[model samples]
Target: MNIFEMLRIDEGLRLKAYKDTEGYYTIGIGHLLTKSPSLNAAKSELDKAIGRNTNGVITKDEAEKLFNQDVDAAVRGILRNAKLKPVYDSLDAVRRAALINMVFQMGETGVAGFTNSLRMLQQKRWDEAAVNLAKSRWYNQTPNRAKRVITTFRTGTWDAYK
Candidate 1:
C-alpha cells in the first residue's frame, strides 16, 4: 500500500478529520482524539483525534481553527494515522493518509469522485492509487492546489498546510 497524494479537497473535511471530538461529528473514540491536549499520543488516540477533528464532518473555517490551535502538530497527528500506522498494514502510510486527506477536503459527499482511486486503495494497488488521485474532478478544478497535494503524497513531503 502506498498511501500518497495531497488531495485538494474542501477544508472542512480536513478540520474534522484532524480536530475530531466526542462532539456530534465525532463520537466515541473519535471524540477522544480531540480530548487529548498533548500533540503526540498513542497511534489509536491520534487516529480517533484526527479522524474526528473534522467531525467525520467539518468546515473550511474549522480547518483554519485547527490550524490555529497547532498547525504542524495537528497535521502531524493526522499524518500519524496515514503516514505512521498505515490504516491497513498492507497499505503504505502515504496512500492511506492521502485517501483520508481527500475525504477530509470534500467530505463523504466527495468520495464518489475518487472511484478509481478508491478502487485502487481497496485492491491495494499502491502505485495506481497515486495516479487515481490526479484523476479526480478536484484535480481538474483546483489544478494548483491539487498538484501541490499530489506532490506531497508522492514524495512523502508536505507544505505544512493548515
Candidate 2:
C-alpha cells in the first residue's frame, strides 16, 4: 500500500484534526500516523497537552472546541503562504515533520516561537538555523523531543524517515 493508505491520512481526517485555529492529533496518535479509538480520543490527548481540563481525559466537546479555536488560525497561517517561500524550502522532511510535531505539542501561538529559526533560514544560514532551533527555550523546555527533532534536521539525511 501507499503511504497515505498506510496512515489513513485522508484529507478530511487531516482537516478535522485542526482545533480552534490550531492543530493537533485527530486520532489516538500523532501525525506520524498513529491510530486511536476515535476523533474524540485523539483530541483528548491534545487538550491535555495544554491543560484544557477534562477530568484528566479529553472529551469530544473539548476536542471540537479546541479545534474550532485553533485549527482555522493555523490553516490561515499556512494558506497565507500558499507558495513555497524561502522559509518553507529551508525545512527538510524531518524538520518539517518535527515542526508539525512541535506545533502539535505547543499549539499555534506557542509554535510561533520559531521565528528566530525562520529569520536564520531567510539568510541562508542552514547550520546556524539548525543550531538556533535546538538552542531555544523550547528545546530545553521540551527535552528529548526537541533534541531528537533538531538532530534529525541537522543531519539532513533522515528527512524521509519521519
Candidate 3:
C-alpha cells in the first residue's frame, strides 16, 4: 500500500473544509487550512481541473501530488535565501529539516520575521531560541505543531511536527 492510501484511511477524505475529529477545518485527508496549502495551491489545480466554480472533492493523487509540489517549492524557496545558507548549513540534518519546514510553512519572510529566534539560533543559544520560538505569534497560532519544532530547536532532537 502507498502512503497516500494510509493518509486517506487515517485522515479521511473530504471535499470541503469540514470539522475533523478535532474540529479543525480539514479537507482531503489531513490537509488543514492552518498550513495545508490545500485551498490555495490545490484550489488552483482543482479549478483548472474542473474549470468551474462548483465545489468538489479532490482525489488522493491530487492532494498528494499537490503536497509534493508544495513541499518542493518550500524547499526551493528556502534554498534561494543566501542568509539562510549559513543557518541551514549550521544545523544537523534533523535541525536543518526543522528550519526548512518552518520556511516551508511560513515562507522565508515569515521565518525572517523571527528576529530574536533567528538571532539566538545564529548565536547557538538553543534554549533561548526555543523560548523565543514559543513566545512568537507563529508559536501561539500553532502550539500543537510548534511544540515539536520548539523542542527540536532547543535540544536538536529530530521530533518536529511529529
Candidate 4:
C-alpha cells in the first residue's frame, strides 16, 4: 500500500474537524487545527481562489495533501528557522520526533516559549531538559503525552505516540 493509505489507516479517516481523544481540535488523518492568523487568511484566499466555501467536506486525497503541507510547514518553520536548529539537528531521531510533535501541538512559536527546556537541551543536559518539559504548563495540560515525550527525551527510547 501507499504511504497515504498507511497514514489514513493509522490516523483514521474523518470528514470533519473534531476534538481528539485529548480534546485538541484535529481533522482528517490527524492534522492538528492551526491557529496561525496568516494561515487562516491564506485559507480564506484559497476559498476565494477556488470560488467556493471551504467549510464543508473534503476528499481523503485533499486531506492527505493538506496533511503533507502542514507537516512540511511545521518542520520547516520549527526546525529550520528557529534558534534551536543546530541543537534540534544534533538530537536522536526519537528526540527529534518528540520536538516535532511538540511543535505540532504548540506551533513553532509556542514551542519556542519553552525557554528553560530548550535552553537545557541546548546545553546538552538531557535529564534537566526532560524535567523542565515535565514542569511546564504544557505538561500540566497534557500529562500523558508530555510524559511519553519527556521519557523519550530523557532516554532516547522509541515512545512516539504509541
Candidate 5:
C-alpha cells in the first residue's frame, strides 16, 4: 500500500473537530488545530477547501488534500532536521516511510526527542532501536500504532500498511 493509504488507516478520518488522545483539537486526518496559526484561520482554510460554510465539517476530498499537505510538511520536517537527514537518507523506502509516518504523528521536535532510539537506528541496530521506542511514553499512550512503527523499524518492512 501507498504511504497515503497507510496514513489514512492509521490516522483515521474525522470530518468534525474533536479532542485527540492527547487532548488537542484535531480534525480531518490528525490535523491539529493547536499547530495552526489560529483556530479561526485553520477553520477558514477548511471551509475554503470544502467550498462551503463547513460548520466544522469537511469533505473526504478536502480532508485528503489536507492530509497530503500535512504529509508533505512532515517529509520536509524530517529532512530539515540536520541530525535526522543522514539517518533518513541511509534507510530503504519502507523504513523511510516509517520515519515519515512517525514525524507525521508526532511533530518533528517530538520525533527528534527520541535521541537514543534514533542513534540506534543510525547505527543499524534494529532491535535496539525497537526496544528504545518501546520504552517511550509514546508507546505507553499508543501501543498499537507504536508497535507497528517499531516493527517496521526493526524489520525494515511495512507493518503499518498491514
Candidate 6:
C-alpha cells in the first residue's frame, strides 16, 4: 500500500474531536489538536476547512484536507531532520513509508530519539533495527502498530498492510 493509504488505515478517521490512546485531543486523521503549536491557529484552520465554526463535527472532505496538511508537515519534518534525512533517503519505498508512518504517530523528534535504530536502518541492518525498535516504551504502548512498522522495516515489504 501507498503511504497515504497506510496512514489512513493506521490512524483511522474521526469526524469529531476525541481523545487518542494517550488521551490527547485529536481530530480528523490523527490530527493532534492538543499538541498543535498554536491552538488558536489550528482551530481556525479547522473552522475554515469545515467552512464554519465547528461543534465537534466535520465532513470527510474537511477531514481529508486536514489529513493532507498533517501528512505534508510530517513529511517535511522527516526531510528536515538532520539525522533522519540521510537515513530516510537511503531507505527503499516500503521502509520509507514505515518511517513516515512512525513519524506521523510519534512526530519527528520522537522517532529521532531512536538513534541506534536509525543507525541500523542506515546500515541496512534490518534485524538490528527491528530489535532496537521493539526495545522501546513505544513498542509496549502500541504493540500492534509497532509490530507492523517494524515488520515493514525488517522485510522491506507491504505485508504489514495486508
**Highest-TM-score candidate:** 6
Q: Candidate 3's residue-wise lDDT over 1-162, tens digit each?
A: 222332234345566656554444455545554434355554554556445653546666666655566556656776787767677767776677678667755678888778778778888899889888888777787676677667867877653433
| Candidate 5 minimal-lDDT segment of 10 residues | 33-42
lDDT of each: 0.46, 0.49, 0.63, 0.66, 0.84, 0.88
The prediction achieving the highest lDDT against the true structure is 6
Q: How do these models rank on TM-score, best leading?
A: 6, 5, 4, 3, 2, 1
Ranking by lDDT: 6, 5, 4, 3, 2, 1
Q: If candidate 3 were superposed on the true structure by all CA atoms, what would the RMSD be?
A: 5.8
Error of 5 at 42 (Å): 7.3
Q: What TM-score quantifies how close candidate 5 is to the native fold?
A: 0.88
Write model 2 residue lDDT over 21-45, tens digit each, in one string: 1233342222321144355665565
Off by over 4 Å in 1: 1-90, 155-162
Record all residue pairs in model 4 with backbone atoms less than 3 Å apart, i.e. clashing: none
lDDT of 1 by residue, 59-119 (tens): 5554444444443343344445433323334445554455455545454345544566655
Give each model a TM-score.
Answer: 0.39, 0.46, 0.69, 0.71, 0.88, 0.90
> On residues 1-162, what C-alpha lDDT tens digit does candidate 4 reach at each position?
322332444457675655566565566667756434344553454444334676634567667667787667767876575565865887776677667767766678888788888888877799989887887787897687678668878877654343
Candidate 6's clash total is 0
C-alpha positional error of residue 160 in candidate 5 after TM-score superposition, expressed in Å? 5.0
Candidate that beats the other on TM-score, 2 or 6, i.e. the better one: 6
Model 1's alpha-carbon lDDT is: 0.46
Q: Global lDDT for candidate 6?
A: 0.88
Model 2 residue-pair collision total: 19
Tell me the alpha-carbon RMSD of every candidate. Answer: 12.0, 9.9, 5.8, 5.0, 2.6, 2.8
